[PDB]
Amino acid sequence: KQMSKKMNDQLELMESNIRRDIRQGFVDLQTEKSDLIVGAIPFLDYKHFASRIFFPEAGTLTAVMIREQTTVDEKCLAFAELIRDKQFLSCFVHALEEQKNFSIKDKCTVASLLTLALHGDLLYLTEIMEDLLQSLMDQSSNANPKLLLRRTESIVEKLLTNWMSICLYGFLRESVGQPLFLLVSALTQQISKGPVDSVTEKALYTLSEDWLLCQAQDFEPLKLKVVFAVGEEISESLEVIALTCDTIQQVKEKILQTFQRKFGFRYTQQIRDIEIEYEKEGKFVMLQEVDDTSEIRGHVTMLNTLKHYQVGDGACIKVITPKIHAPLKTQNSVKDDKNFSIKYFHLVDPPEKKALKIKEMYLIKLLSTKVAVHSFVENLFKSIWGLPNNKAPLAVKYFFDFLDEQAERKKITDPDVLHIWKTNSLPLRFWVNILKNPDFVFSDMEKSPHLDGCLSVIAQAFMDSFSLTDTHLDKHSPTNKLLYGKDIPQYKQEVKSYYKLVKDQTSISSQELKTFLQEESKKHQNEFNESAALRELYKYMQRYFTEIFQKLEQTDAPSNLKENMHRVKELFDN
Amino acid sequence: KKMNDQLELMESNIRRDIRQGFVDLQTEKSDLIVGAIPFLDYKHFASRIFFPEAGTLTAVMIRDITTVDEKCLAFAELIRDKQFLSCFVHALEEQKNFSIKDKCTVASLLTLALHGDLLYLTEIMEDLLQSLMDQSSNANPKLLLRRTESIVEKLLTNWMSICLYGFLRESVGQPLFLLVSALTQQISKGPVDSVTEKALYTLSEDWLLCQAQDFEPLKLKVVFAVEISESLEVIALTCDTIQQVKEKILQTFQRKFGFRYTQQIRDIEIEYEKEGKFVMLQEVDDTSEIRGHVTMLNTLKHYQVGDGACIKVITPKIHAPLKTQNSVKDDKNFSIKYFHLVDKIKEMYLIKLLSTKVAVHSFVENLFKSIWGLPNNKAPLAVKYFFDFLDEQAERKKITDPDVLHIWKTNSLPLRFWVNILKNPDFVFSDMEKSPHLDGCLSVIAQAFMDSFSLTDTHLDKHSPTNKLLYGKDIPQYKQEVKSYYKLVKDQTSISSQELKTFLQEESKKHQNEFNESAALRELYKYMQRYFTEIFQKLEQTDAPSNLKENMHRVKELFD
Amino acid sequence: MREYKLVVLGSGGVGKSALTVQFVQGIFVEKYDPTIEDSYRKQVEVDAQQCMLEILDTAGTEQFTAMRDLYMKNGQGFALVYSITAQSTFNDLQDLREQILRVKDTDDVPMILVGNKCDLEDERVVGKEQGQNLARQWNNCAFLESSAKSKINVNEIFYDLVRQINS
Amino acid sequence: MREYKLVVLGSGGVGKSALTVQFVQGIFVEKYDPTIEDSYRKQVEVDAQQCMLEILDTAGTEQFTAMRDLYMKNGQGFALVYSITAQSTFNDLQDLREQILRVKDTDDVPMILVGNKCDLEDERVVGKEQGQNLARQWNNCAFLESSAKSKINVNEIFYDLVRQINSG
Ligand SMILES: Nc1nc2c(ncn2[C@@H]2O[C@H](COP(=O)(O)OP(=O)(O)O)[C@@H](O)[C@H]2O)c(=O)[nH]1
Ligand SMILES: Nc1nc2c(ncn2[C@@H]2O[C@H](COP(=O)(O)OP(=O)(O)O)[C@@H](O)[C@H]2O)c(=O)[nH]1
Numbered sequence A: 001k002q003m004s005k006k007m008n009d010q011l012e013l014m015e016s017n018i019r020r021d022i023r024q025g026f027v028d029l030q031t032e033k034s035d036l037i038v039g040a041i042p043f044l045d046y047k048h049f050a051s052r053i054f055f056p057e058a059g060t061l062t063a064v065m066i067r068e069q070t071t072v073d074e075k076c077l078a079f080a081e082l083i084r085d086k087q088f089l090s091c092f093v094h095a096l097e098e099q100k101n102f103s104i105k106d107k108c109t110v111a112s113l114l115t116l117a118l119h120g121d122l123l124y125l126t127e128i129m130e131d132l133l134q135s136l137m138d139q140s141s142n143a144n145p146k147l148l149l150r151r152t153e154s155i156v157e158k159l160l161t162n163w164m165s166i167c168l169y170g171f172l173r174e175s176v177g178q179p180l181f182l183l184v185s186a187l188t189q190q191i192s193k194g195p196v197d198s199v200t201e202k203a204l205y206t207l208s209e210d211w212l213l214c215q216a217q218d219f220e221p222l223k224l225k226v227v228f229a230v231g232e233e234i235s236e237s238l239e240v241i242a243l244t245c246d247t248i249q250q251v252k253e254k255i256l257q258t259f260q261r262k263f264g265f266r267y268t269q270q271i272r273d274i275e276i277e278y279e280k281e282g283k284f285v286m287l288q289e290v291d292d293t294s295e296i297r298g299h300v301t302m303l304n305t306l307k308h309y310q311v312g313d314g315a316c317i318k319v320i321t322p323k324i325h326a327p328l329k330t331q332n333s334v335k336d337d338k339n340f341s342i343k344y345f346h347l348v349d350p351p352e353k354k355a356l357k358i359k360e361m362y363l364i365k366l367l368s369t370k371v372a373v374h375s376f377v378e379n380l381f382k383s384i385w386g387l388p389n390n391k392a393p394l395a396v397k398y399f400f401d402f403l404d405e406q407a408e409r410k411k412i413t414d415p416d417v418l419h420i421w422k423t424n425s426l427p428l429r430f431w432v433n434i435l436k437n438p439d440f441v442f443s444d445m446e447k448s449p450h451l452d453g454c455l456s457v458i459a460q461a462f463m464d465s466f467s468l469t470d471t472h473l474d475k476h477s478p479t480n481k482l483l484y485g486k487d488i489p490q491y492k493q494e495v496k497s498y499y500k501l502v503k504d505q506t507s508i509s510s511q512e513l514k515t516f517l518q519e520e521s522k523k524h525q526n527e528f529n530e531s532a533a534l535r536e537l538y539k540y541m542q543r544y545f546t547e548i549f550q551k552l553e554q555t556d557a558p559s560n561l562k563e564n565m566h567r568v569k570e571l572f573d574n
Numbered sequence B: 001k002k003m004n005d006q007l008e009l010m011e012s013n014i015r016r017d018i019r020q021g022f023v024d025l026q027t028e029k030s031d032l033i034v035g036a037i038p039f040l041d042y043k044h045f046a047s048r049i050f051f052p053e054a055g056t057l058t059a060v061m062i063r064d065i066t067t068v069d070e071k072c073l074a075f076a077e078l079i080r081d082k083q084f085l086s087c088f089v090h091a092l093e094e095q096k097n098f099s100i101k102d103k104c105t106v107a108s109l110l111t112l113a114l115h116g117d118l119l120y121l122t123e124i125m126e127d128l129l130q131s132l133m134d135q136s137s138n139a140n141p142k143l144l145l146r147r148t149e150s151i152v153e154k155l156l157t158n159w160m161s162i163c164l165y166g167f168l169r170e171s172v173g174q175p176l177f178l179l180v181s182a183l184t185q186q187i188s189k190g191p192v193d194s195v196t197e198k199a200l201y202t203l204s205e206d207w208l209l210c211q212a213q214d215f216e217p218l219k220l221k222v223v224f225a226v227e228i229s230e231s232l233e234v235i236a237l238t239c240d241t242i243q244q245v246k247e248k249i250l251q252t253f254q255r256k257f258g259f260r261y262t263q264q265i266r267d268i269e270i271e272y273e274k275e276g277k278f279v280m281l282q283e284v285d286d287t288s289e290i291r292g293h294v295t296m297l298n299t300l301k302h303y304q305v306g307d308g309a310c311i312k313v314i315t316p317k318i319h320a321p322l323k324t325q326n327s328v329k330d331d332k333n334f335s336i337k338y339f340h341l342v343d344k345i346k347e348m349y350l351i352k353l354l355s356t357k358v359a360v361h362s363f364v365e366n367l368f369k370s371i372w373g374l375p376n377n378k379a380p381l382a383v384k385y386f387f388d389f390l391d392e393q394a395e396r397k398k399i400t401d402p403d404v405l406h407i408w409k410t411n412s413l414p415l416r417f418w419v420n421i422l423k424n425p426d427f428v429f430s431d432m433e434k435s436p437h438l439d440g441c442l443s444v445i446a447q448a449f450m451d452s453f454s455l456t457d458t459h460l461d462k463h464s465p466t467n468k469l470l471y472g473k474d475i476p477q478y479k480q481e482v483k484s485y486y487k488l489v490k491d492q493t494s495i496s497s498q499e500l501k502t503f504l505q506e507e508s509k510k511h512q513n514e515f516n517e518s519a520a521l522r523e524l525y526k527y528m529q530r531y532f533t534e535i536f537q538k539l540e541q542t543d544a545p546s547n548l549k550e551n552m553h554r555v556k557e558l559f560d
Numbered sequence C: 001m002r003e004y005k006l007v008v009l010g011s012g013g014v015g016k017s018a019l020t021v022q023f024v025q026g027i028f029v030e031k032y033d034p035t036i037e038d039s040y041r042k043q044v045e046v047d048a049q050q051c052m053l054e055i056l057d058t059a060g061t062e063q064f065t066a067m068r069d070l071y072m073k074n075g076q077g078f079a080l081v082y083s084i085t086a087q088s089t090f091n092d093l094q095d096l097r098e099q100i101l102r103v104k105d106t107d108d109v110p111m112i113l114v115g116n117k118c119d120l121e122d123e124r125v126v127g128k129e130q131g132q133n134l135a136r137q138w139n140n141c142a143f144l145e146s147s148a149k150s151k152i153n154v155n156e157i158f159y160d161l162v163r164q165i166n167s
Numbered sequence D: 001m002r003e004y005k006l007v008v009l010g011s012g013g014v015g016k017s018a019l020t021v022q023f024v025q026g027i028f029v030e031k032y033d034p035t036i037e038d039s040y041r042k043q044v045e046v047d048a049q050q051c052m053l054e055i056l057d058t059a060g061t062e063q064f065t066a067m068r069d070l071y072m073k074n075g076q077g078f079a080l081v082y083s084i085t086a087q088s089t090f091n092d093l094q095d096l097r098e099q100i101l102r103v104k105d106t107d108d109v110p111m112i113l114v115g116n117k118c119d120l121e122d123e124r125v126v127g128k129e130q131g132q133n134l135a136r137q138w139n140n141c142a143f144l145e146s147s148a149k150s151k152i153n154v155n156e157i158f159y160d161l162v163r164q165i166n167s168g
């Protein structure tokens, strides 16, 4: 009978704890203000943007493609004059895909190299993408029309992403860039309001259940007066807000974020150079990320926070660099360690508290954050499928008329197919790509895997608005759909209305195409170099020569083309 | 070692429940709701407002069914003089025996009596209210009209009703009825305990069902006797009591047909199809879950009612000669005798208070925006005039604080009138049986409503009322509209007396055959003969001509 | 912990919301906002025993026709409040007691008489001895002159209500 | 109940989402919704032992520039999927498995090769022996022809993955 007492008491304390918890969750959700937000958006120049989109593989090497010598490399001239051929390039695109040695990476590569080579003449590129896309459709072997463009089994698809990017850049910098940067900033700022685990990057505020910090943690916003040194005693005040649970580096990152947000110049290139001092007895003692007074759970040491140092509100805190007094006040950056995720921990390490780890009890936070940044999400979404001056971007309208006419060319009596093609070609293969890689559009954008997860969530939400089936979300459906389940149908309506509006807009003769594509081509002919492109495509031409030659011979090839082929070989050789 | 399993099931159910709250909150599709709005005739309106106490008896003040009564005209002649009436109300107010209810009484009687001459009523109300205002020795200008310590206040409520009724039927009534119907419907969408009336869905933590009841929405094929048969579909829950199911069938009938199936619920019985034969199900039978001195009512789930089940209905003239059960709801002590859902965490269901709060929100916005809305870029006549009075008086008492203006406006108009209409919908609409739960919810909405008038930016915390947190995010938008609404009336054109006199006269003449002055003055006199020494001692001090005293004593000679 | 439903009653603007906020949120602000319906709650200990309070701040006795009956039946502890600035607020406490004892249908109803705003000694119109006389008049009931602006007798109210519910 | 992280990799429209939903809700609906990122989880009794599974439903290989390496890094089990109606998708799995082994920096990784849509034998392109020989070529790897539409070997995938995680 003695155990009954302990059991009852336990369940009691646990219950009341859960009370305080859920209560705090509701109170929080209701009392969450929107103190988010910038000015000049750090846009990228078209060269860097396009290069990052075409080759997000070797990010730094992509500077090799940004621009006499052309006239010198006659091989490049021959190859170039050869690419301008429709039949040749057709065989060149099909024969490669025909071979099983030709992987996905090979396909992306080819598509982008071909885009850079054909970036001077975008007319021809448009027309060849049209034939390459119609051949992936009309004479497609594995063709279930509502499943087209989904599996990356062709070069044409990645090509289509490239072309969408090329043609829609203007529209991005004009009408979509601001809300996208505003959303990335919104999320970033929002997540920095609540605790983040320094070792798992899991945070309290988030849009992803996977990324959620379902850990019990008591925190409180600390206002910190920041002093900068420039000798021994030099001080200038600054207001920086942190948390009681923030690790040292996290604090450093916050004061640096703030500093840049007030002076437009990073106080330091590398964050490791700065050390942080604290005042307790009127004297400043440098605080380090981990000291001799740090608890150890088994074989792993715990990171020192601000509550670890008993830091209170209005605390004065000093900033030192490497040229001030770091001759002796230098600490070793913990995060630099190879196995830092095994040697250290912050807010996570693997009876009342045993049941306080319940994941669902934190799902409301996903709601809260979803509530916090919903204005920016809606802004971005509406600015993506909206039409300024009642007209649509040239490439969008044109390409949708192209799809419509294609469906007309194949005798298709199901509007669902047209819808599917429209949503598989543009938003999936383009808009999601900008949505999931905002660094393609902006500079000095460091993307975290967490923010990647949040953007993943918003992207999926964006994709469900292009669905055709009213999905019944129950207890079995993933949270990422649940969060945006209410806003989906409005978006769906706006989508169908959007495709309608695009369909009913006045058609476009190829005169406008002429002036436009010529304008873009003349705008970007000298930016990249077709030399490296063609030289890096030759590696592909000679590696599958017999198959291309065969595919071209089966389609009645003139002597001229083949003589030019062997000429290219002879020029590259001799 | 027997705590691991108990806590296993415990935390399991917990997870499932919180996740289910989140899912329901995310999967909540709007499907609320009318046609014509059953408003009350101006008579019953005015009467149920003037005397909310005597419920039915108010119809005795309605002459919708005086030269002989020699005592009425004399006392009315007395009231006709401003001095006599002023000293009357004042002297009566200065009494310790004069209870709170007596003030509402005399106010309502006075308004009812002088309903025929709105000019004199308006004038004397202005004078008396200014008396309450500028000469108040024990009052703070910012706490004016707050403490019910004058006839002028209840009288003000009455006058507000009189003058704003037209606007009520104009643009505020319909959204109100829509919000009430939507609220009732929403609450009734989720399980309700028959004993406590605590439902899962609500807008009040007090009125919250804090128990995890695993239910399931069922489409029931209902049949009607006349033998005879007629198909219908009723959406009932598996946890619903037999009388709850009955209420849902009756509601569905009265909605989809336009006329009610009956007037009494006690005279209907429900049959269920077992295996061909129909067994009439009762509220409590033998095998009922009895726990001490309390017994569990039969739910649908108790009889294993499947989805798409067949249901028959029985009237007292059909086959209910011997086929009739007794009504448990009539039991003088039913709470103590039977139980339904109740006989353990509350905050876990605060989420529900959100769900409903969203489902019934558009209607709330319609009601609020209507109340402080301007039809054809024009504010109500009474509003502009009364606020003009407040402005002029504030300019007449050496005050330089716009806060006092706002506070007077928020203690006179929305508090005295709009709350009275918001919390009491049956003062507006006929056949609206008022439930306590709906009264609680309406108290929440009315609370938010008047919080939208506050001049104090109060940050909501953990120690704030759930009702405040439930509408706190939406408040500060309303505040800015309320603030701007007030200033528009200030910037509205001054009301010409040519429009005023006509506006009063039309209604005065259109309501001269509505109320009887007889019973009114007859009930009003009783306060005079009660405190005569006070009235005389005040009147003689206020320089009373021999006319007033001769007339008064003549009235006393005609009444005794 | 134990659940404790309490009700705060009084005339319009007698410091009910004031006392309540002063007791739960600790802070006081001279603000002018009419209360309609506010169900509070707070974890608080009495007689070395922690319990869970449940306050209901009510509205003016006649600012509007309201649910005057529900909370009298369901309530357990009652704090009646007048202001020592206006006399009528003291004159309006009788019918309150009446309806309480009537609806609850018993003479043993946990109640406390409070003359709030005891920080105004120049506008005082109701004596303390008057309130004490009314206190003894109600079968020797408790009487505590309080003030939400000075944290005087604030906690003692609710603590006494709980204590009276106990015994 | 331990938590398992099973990741479903593949190309565009091979039935990753189909298999995951069929495993989770038991329902198959012929629809067309490109998965971008969907996180499922379910409690299931494996080998008379109730464990907590977490199925991550990824997108096609190259539908957009994506975060392939993250869920590979954290993932404990992998179910590579290919439609037997398209040889291309069956070819595309090689570099994927290569990336798995490279990131995990080992060879004893819980993994299964699944040839979905084995209910369309009249439209089959990839023979069973192809995928079987490929599984044999991938160090006696686990192989299954599945059909989320016809409920064929839907659960045995994740099951065998769990049984492999606890294996040596
Ligand atoms: N000096 C003083 N003023 C008070 C006290 N309590 C309330 N007040 C003031 O009285 C006014 C109205 O009181 P309030 O509590 O809002 O009225 P209620 O909501 O109807 O109970 C407020 O503006 C307060 O500033 C007190 O204890 N001392
Ligand atoms: N016959 C058959 N069709 C399937 C099966 N699984 C998926 N599908 C079809 O494949 C289409 C796309 O599948 P989906 O789940 O979206 O592919 P995912 O990209 O891997 O998520 C759907 O329309 C289904 O009809 C299966 O097991 N059998």
Ligand SMILES: [Mg+2]
Binding pocket: C016, C017, C018, C034, C035, C036, C057, C058, C059
């Ligand atoms: Mg109050």
Ligand SMILES: [Mg+2]
Binding pocket: D016, D017, D018, D034, D035, D036, D057, D058, D059, D060
């Ligand atoms: Mg998918």
